[PDB]
Amino acid sequence: MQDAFTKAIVAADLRGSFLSEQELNQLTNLVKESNKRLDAVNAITGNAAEIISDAAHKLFAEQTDLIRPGGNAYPNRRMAACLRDMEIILRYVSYALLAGDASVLEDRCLNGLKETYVALGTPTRSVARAVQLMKETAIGYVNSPSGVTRGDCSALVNEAATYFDKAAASIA
Amino acid sequence: MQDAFTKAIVAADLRGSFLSEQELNQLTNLVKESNKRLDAVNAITGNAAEIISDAAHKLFAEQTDLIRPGGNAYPNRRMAACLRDMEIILRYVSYALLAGDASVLEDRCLNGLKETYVALGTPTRSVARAVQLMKETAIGYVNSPSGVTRGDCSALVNEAATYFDKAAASIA
Amino acid sequence: MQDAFTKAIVAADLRGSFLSEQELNQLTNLVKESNKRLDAVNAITGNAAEIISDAAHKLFAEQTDLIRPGGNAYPNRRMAACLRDMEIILRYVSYALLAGDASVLEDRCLNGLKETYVALGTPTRSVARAVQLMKETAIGYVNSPSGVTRGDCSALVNEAATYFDKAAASIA
Amino acid sequence: MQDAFTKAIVAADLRGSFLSEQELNQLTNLVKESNKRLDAVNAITGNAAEIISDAAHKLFAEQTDLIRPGGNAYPNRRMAACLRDMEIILRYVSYALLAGDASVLEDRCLNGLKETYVALGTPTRSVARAVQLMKETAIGYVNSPSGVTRGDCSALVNEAATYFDKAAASIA
Amino acid sequence: MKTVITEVIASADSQGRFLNNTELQAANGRFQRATASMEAARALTSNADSLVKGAVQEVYNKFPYLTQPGQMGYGDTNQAKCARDISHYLRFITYSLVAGGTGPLDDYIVAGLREVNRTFNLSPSWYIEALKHIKGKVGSQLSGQPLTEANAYIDYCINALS
Amino acid sequence: MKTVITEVIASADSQGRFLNNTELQAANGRFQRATASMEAARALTSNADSLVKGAVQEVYNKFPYLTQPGQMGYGDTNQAKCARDISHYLRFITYSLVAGGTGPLDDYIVAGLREVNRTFNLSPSWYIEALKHIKGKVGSQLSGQPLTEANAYIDYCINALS
Amino acid sequence: MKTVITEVIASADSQGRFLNNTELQAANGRFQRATASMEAARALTSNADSLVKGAVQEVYNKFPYLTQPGQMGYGDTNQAKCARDISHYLRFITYSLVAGGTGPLDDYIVAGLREVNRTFNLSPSWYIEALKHIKGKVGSQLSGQPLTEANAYIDYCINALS
Amino acid sequence: MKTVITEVIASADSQGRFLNNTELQAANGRFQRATASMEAARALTSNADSLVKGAVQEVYNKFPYLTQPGQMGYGDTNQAKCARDISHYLRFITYSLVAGGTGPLDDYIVAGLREVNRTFNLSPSWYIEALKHIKGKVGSQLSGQPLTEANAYIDYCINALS
Amino acid sequence: KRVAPYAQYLTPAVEATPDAAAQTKLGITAVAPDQAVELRPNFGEAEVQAVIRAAYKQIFGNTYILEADRVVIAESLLRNGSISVREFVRLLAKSDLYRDRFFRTASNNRFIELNFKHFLGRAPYSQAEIGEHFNRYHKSGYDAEIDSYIDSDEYRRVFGENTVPYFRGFKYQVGQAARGFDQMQQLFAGDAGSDTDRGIGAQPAAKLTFPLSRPLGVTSAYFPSSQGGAATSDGLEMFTRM
């Protein structure tokens, strides 16, 4: 598994080199913003259930076919499979936010995720949408939390978004 | 698993008849040369480590790219894997040599091996070469050993070579 | 598994109570001395091999009986087992030292150990001694290390000793 | 308790039968050799002290660790216990020899003995050896005594040996 | 019981390995963070009970039918067992604060929670609402990293109940 | 690749729980520690050239016979491959410093070490002595927690080789 | 196919080691033994025709009723398939003799024997009696270690059928 | 899908075995029982409309507050999704009646029930009370073994929700 | 004393790669895999969860095992300590969820592939290997068939009584046939990929039948090559050496 430092190290090694002063300071900056990062990961963990629930309510509000017989979130067994899914992805996204690298997401989750769904008959476009809704709400929470020091988290909100967007793209 | 006798038996059975005095005497000759065969297998066993080591030293002497970063015998983990594969192949070649038949070599070792290496990014041409070097040194030992009775081992040296050459061909 | 805090918590809970101001400050002190504790655990980790080696050299200096056929550290297989056990015990002592509680040592290492050795015919008094020697050298290292800030580590040296002494007592 | 006749009787009874002419004559032969048997038991009784003493001298000649501090035949108390056990075992071997059956030896001496010694920390291999030495000397005496009529006692010497060997095997 | 210390030790042990610089760096985090944690702990410790009576009542005010006769917020014994239960939660929150991990919560409240609540007809909604209220008031007893810690664990309980 | 960050994530994943406050401090340790680590890294990085030549020579000064003909410290190629190898070690030490764990050392030097050294007739003693020397000189390039970090990883390599 | 060489090679492969002495020593046995084995093989090979007709008949002489109408020793096809079957056994005996092990017998006659015989209403007793007879006559075609070899394998079939 | 027929077949298959008198006796039970089951099924089928409206209302009458604004028994969509859900239960009850086992209930309502209800803030108590009411009225639509069957499955759902 | 220049040796390196093979292959990195969630003495709660969470993923082929279906008693015995990891496994394999998910709707061939994956972490090395298992099913039935994996020399030698089974197909194991490696890739779909039948319900036709039987192949004749670079010929080689 990689994190943002480990990634630097692998690229340096492929040159046969000690880390460039370029790469060093990029990583010094990641340490600089790490308290914000911890709050951002904490924002997701602290609202995981609601993020999944709210995404869910809204997914089925839009796509009332999934909860009809014939639909891929019917009966209870399938809904439970779907609702757990949302939570995993939200949880996976927040690991990446702290690692500062998408690899755990791509390798352990998205890795193989598209394939399954087509074999199963699970509508990937609906799954992509559920991921887009988790993103909206998750970032909502990253941006408006309990008594965190005021500052600018937009860099981290972007990065979190790209993890949500990776997953969506990979699946649709 | 087959040996040279077992092979005879399978071909006889497919005719639904007994030994064709032809096949009997071919096998009587294998028994005739079996002391030499035991010395030949013993030559390899008794120098396995040096055969691998010497092949290795020479492989990396020729292909200094493998031991650079980016190279398939770098870092220590990969070199140990490469040294291990050299041993595995030398092992199954010695088994074939005791057996008088290539099948154990082809069935357990060579079958699928090329496609493994390609999946891994392991340069098959370099692996083929490492096998060619093991052959040179192994046969060296088969031909010039400790106080073995003097005679002609060229038939066995050829046969050993074809096992080394099978492996090389199969992999490159 | 317990650490020094977890232990406090279990005792508090058995009263049905929030932690006593008594217990709170005992734990505040643990946090106060924690940099020293980290150096102490680091002293052992950084010299594990030598601590085992030096204990060993000295154990067999004293007790040649084990080194001779009939002895419990003969032949190579048994010596490797004995060297391995020295490492295992030093390892759980270091864990206890990071934790501020003996429980991991007692539960995962010492529990049943004496009866194992007696079943095996392993002389427990010799094992106890090997533990006493590890203690001498380990503490040596805790007390005289590379450019650590000067101060008083005797409280921690005592506590480490009691873990070595627990193990010795439990085994002899 | 069994003797050689009693053993016959128990096996006959388990068939519901009067003793077989087979078994009758086996027992007639035991009566035939009984004077020799009495001399053989007498050989042991008449030299019990020396048999134990000589076994002992030789045991500690070989295993000088037992008489060092830390050793299982140190101090006087333990040596007296060890000398006592040598006598006890020699005693039950002589009983078996009068009886023509091992049962008294197995039932009132050997049963549980190994587990006793292990509980005590008494080295069973040393005890086995002390028994082997008693055997050598005891048989010595059975074979070369004071003005007994000349004849062949090898059958009885074997049987005595198996009693010594039972004990050794049972204990080691 | 999950703490930073037990976690790194568990990870070392399971690879048959002495603690190394990775694991000791981790431990330093837990020790460096003790001051904020323990300040939160002391504040939550001394300002305690009323939180329970406040949350108990709020369960009845939000579910009025609760405090009516024939209901589970009626009579001394229900209302007594409620205060007790919220008190259990706050107690384990303080323990988790002091311990440096969720262990006390995981072992004494989370393991088995749903089975128990389901057999006894206890709705999680009450407990979430007790905790949401406790979270509102703890906004003005603490601030900075002690508040973040208090929040972390209160929220952890709310997610355990959803 | 073992870092504090990857370790806690691995433990969550294998356990399926959101990164929560017990874990966050582990991570905070690694981030709080970065300054000392990275100072050690910069000092080891710019002195690399001389640290390597110093240790290479010390291998010959401690094992004089290595530099005689027919030996493995003789001729340009042996002496070249030696400098390179110590340079590999210092490189991975800096990586381990920067990464917040032993991962780079574990994956690129420790995994397979003995098999390789045994096939190629390379004695660990040389490498330990190279590292003991590097440890002596790093005593005056750094101090405080950067030195402790440098030491942690140098010692880690020496234990890997014993 | 189970034989001396094959077995030792398999052992080596499983152990992932090297053809050492134990193995070589074991293999020599198989080679040293080939002469007696192969003499038995040649004698059984050229007498096959009559050994088969002798044993076939003996099955009818020992089980007279088999040759009456409505029975399984009656008509050209039963009596033909019988000769064939004994011929299969002698064939695999010669193969086992030449191969240096029971492999050919294990793989081509023993594996599955009872299931087949049970579905087709074939009594092992016939086959044992065919083999007992073949064993009687092979007493005067061979002697010494070739006879011992022939016997080893005939008996192996009798035990396999039992 | 669990029925008497599938169960006995599963048990045979898993022992590699033809259906025997044990398994066919079992099947006869399921077939003998079909008449009572299917009478219950027809009665529950034609009364479905009113059984559903009766139970839906009873959920509001037993939990009056549900029908106030801001609550989950308010507005067309909640009240619509409720009727639907009870209708799902009655539907699977009839299926279980017709099928000769709990399979349809196990596969389409029980598997996953709690996870779903917990994510969506649906209290089992409502559903139990819907079913308790349906059980009251089915007392006078059926009697004898059809009633026992209807009861068996209604009670099965109530236990699934406790 | 100055250095014989050595910077030529570190150029590029040639076409160079950087511990890529596992990642390019995809998923191999996750599964070039750290040993299982072993059980120690005095195991605490943390330890039991790792073994239990881990075991399910590993033996149920990564299919989502929902909260509503845990095998409540498998784990109880494992916690109270009566049984090992090895008999914890043997009790999950004969459970309904294992039975239901893989045996019931797969042919035999297909069903046999998954036990090699779930139980020994490798692909069947040979065509014969499927023969033996299928046959044992025919005489001994289903339960005996499962027993054979767990209770076998290969499983026992490697997973002891306390380790949990893990993918080992991607590394050379002594005695495996050459085709173990590529075959394992068909079996493994990457970390998201799960071995489950929900899409059809039936589950797929066995993947390895055609892969299992691909032939030897005889690039025969074959004339070797000395080029390469120019290689010495002459008699002088020994002599110079002498």
Ligand SMILES: CCC1=C(C)/C(=C/C2=NC(=C\c3[nH]c(/C=C4\NC(=O)[C@H](C)[C@H]4CC)c(C)c3CCC(=O)O)/C(CCC(=O)O)=C2C)NC1=O
């Ligand atoms: C237990 C693990 C852990 C956490 C969670 C942690 C958080 C943490 N967040 C901090 C700051 C902060 N955190 C934020 C975060 C935000 N600002 C906003 O306006 C956004 C809504 C939000 C975006 C994510 C900001 C702006 C600061 C102050 C600037 C800084 O220190 O970087 C600080 C510095 C002290 C302070 O200023 O309060 C800490 C210690 N430390 C830890 O050890």
Ligand SMILES: CCC1=C(C)/C(=C/C2=NC(=C\c3[nH]c(/C=C4\NC(=O)[C@H](C)[C@H]4CC)c(C)c3CCC(=O)O)/C(CCC(=O)O)=C2C)NC1=O
């Ligand atoms: C422990 C297993 C085992 C071994 C290894 C074994 C070896 C063995 N090698 C032998 C002969 C021999 N071995 C060789 C071998 C060679 N000649 C050469 O010049 C080459 C360098 C080498 C080629 C391989 C030769 C030429 C003979 C004599 C001819 C013969 O017996 O076939 C003999 C016959 C006795 C003798 O003449 O010394 C034995 C017993 N026997 C065994 O039971």
Ligand SMILES: CCC1=C(C)/C(=C/C2=NC(=C\c3[nH]c(/C=C4\NC(=O)[C@H](C)[C@H]4CC)c(C)c3CCC(=O)O)/C(CCC(=O)O)=C2C)NC1=O
């Ligand atoms: C990577 C994990 C990690 C470690 C190892 C760590 C060590 C560490 N040890 C420290 C102090 C110290 N460490 C010691 C230790 C000792 N004094 C002696 O004379 C004895 C030989 C030795 C006994 C163990 C002392 C006396 C201090 C200064 C007092 C204190 O800070 O408590 C400090 C405070 C800064 C300083 O004064 O240097 C740190 C950060 N911090 C970490 O995050």
Ligand SMILES: CCC1=C(C)/C(=C/C2=NC(=C\c3[nH]c(/C=C4\NC(=O)[C@H](C)[C@H]4CC)c(C)c3CCC(=O)O)/C(CCC(=O)O)=C2C)NC1=O
């Ligand atoms: C007080 C109890 C008691 C004893 C001890 C006893 C001994 C005894 N031993 C005897 C014979 C004998 N005893 C032996 C014994 C031996 N021959 C050897 O060369 C060996 C050294 C030794 C082996 C044990 C032999 C060979 C005979 C003569 C043959 C025989 O009578 O069976 C005889 C027959 C008379 C004689 O020939 O002297 C008696 C009465 N009788 C008794 O009532």
Ligand SMILES: CCC1=C(C)/C(=C/C2=NC(=C\c3[nH]c(/C=C4\NC(=O)[C@H](C)[C@H]4CC)c(C)c3CCC(=O)O)/C(CCC(=O)O)=C2C)NC1=O
């Ligand atoms: C160590 C951690 C721990 C927790 C959290 C815990 C919860 C818990 N609550 C219980 C009962 C209860 N819990 C309540 C709760 C409430 N009643 C009200 O007025 C409110 C609606 C609500 C508070 C918000 C009630 C009324 C009972 C009695 C249930 C019964 O027995 O009928 C019981 C059953 C045993 C008993 O009757 O005491 C348990 C185990 N037990 C524990 O050991």
Ligand SMILES: CCC1=C(C)/C(=C/C2=NC(=C\c3[nH]c(/C=C4\NC(=O)[C@H](C)[C@H]4CC)c(C)c3CCC(=O)O)/C(CCC(=O)O)=C2C)NC1=O
């Ligand atoms: C990524 C991490 C990594 C390490 C650590 C590494 C070590 C390493 N050292 C090697 C050789 C070597 N290593 C040395 C070492 C020395 N010679 C001397 O003068 C001194 C005594 C000593 C330095 C202290 C020598 C002489 C060789 C050549 C061995 C040979 O091929 O005969 C080789 C064999 C391949 C080659 O010839 O380059 C490896 C793999 N390789 C790696 O990829």
Ligand SMILES: CCC1=C(C)/C(=C/C2=NC(=C\c3[nH]c(/C=C4\NC(=O)[C@H](C)[C@H]4CC)c(C)c3CCC(=O)O)/C(CCC(=O)O)=C2C)NC1=O
């Ligand atoms: C490769 C080794 C091998 C063996 C050993 C073998 C045995 C064998 N014997 C068979 C039949 C038979 N075997 C016999 C045997 C006999 N009939 C008599 O007159 C005698 C009593 C007796 C000879 C002692 C008979 C009568 C049948 C025909 C059974 C039937 O189809 O009804 C069949 C059924 C297929 C067929 O009808 O040919 C098999 C497989 N098959 C094999 O492939």
Ligand SMILES: CCC1=C(C)/C(=C/C2=NC(=C\c3[nH]c(/C=C4\NC(=O)[C@H](C)[C@H]4CC)c(C)c3CCC(=O)O)/C(CCC(=O)O)=C2C)NC1=O
């Ligand atoms: C095949 C079997 C099956 C069942 C049993 C089932 C239950 C079920 N009920 C749901 C929602 C719901 N269920 C209700 C239930 C009620 N509201 C009220 O007025 C009453 C209090 C109560 C009826 C007693 C409500 C209000 C919702 C909407 C929840 C939401 O999305 O906020 C949902 C979420 C998807 C959706 O919004 O439709 C499921 C899956 N789904 C199934 O596929």
Ligand SMILES: CCC1=C(C)/C(=C/C2=NC(=C\c3[nH]c(/C=C4\NC(=O)[C@H](C)[C@H]4CC)c(C)c3CCC(=O)O)/C(CCC(=O)O)=C2C)NC1=O
């Ligand atoms: C590596 C981490 C990981 C992921 C991501 C994963 C996905 C995954 N989702 C699955 C099923 C499923 N996934 C869903 C999801 C949905 N249904 C919908 O209609 C929505 C569009 C969507 C929810 C947003 C459903 C309904 C199934 C069950 C399909 C069936 O069995 O019919 C399955 C089959 C096994 C099972 O049912 O447990 C896998 C492997 N598995 C994993 O181990």
Ligand SMILES: CCC1=C(C)/C(=C/C2=NC(=C\c3[nH]c(/C=C4\NC(=O)[C@H](C)[C@H]4CC)c(C)c3CCC(=O)O)/C(CCC(=O)O)=C2C)NC1=O
């Ligand atoms: C059946 C007997 C058998 C064989 C033959 C076998 C080959 C084999 N070689 C492998 C890797 C490897 N093989 C090599 C070999 C080489 N690298 C080079 O640059 C050289 C050209 C060559 C040495 C001469 C390397 C470096 C790897 C590791 C690839 C990686 O992980 O990046 C792997 C992947 C699993 C692992 O790394 O353990 C297999 C299965 N496995 C087996 O079980």
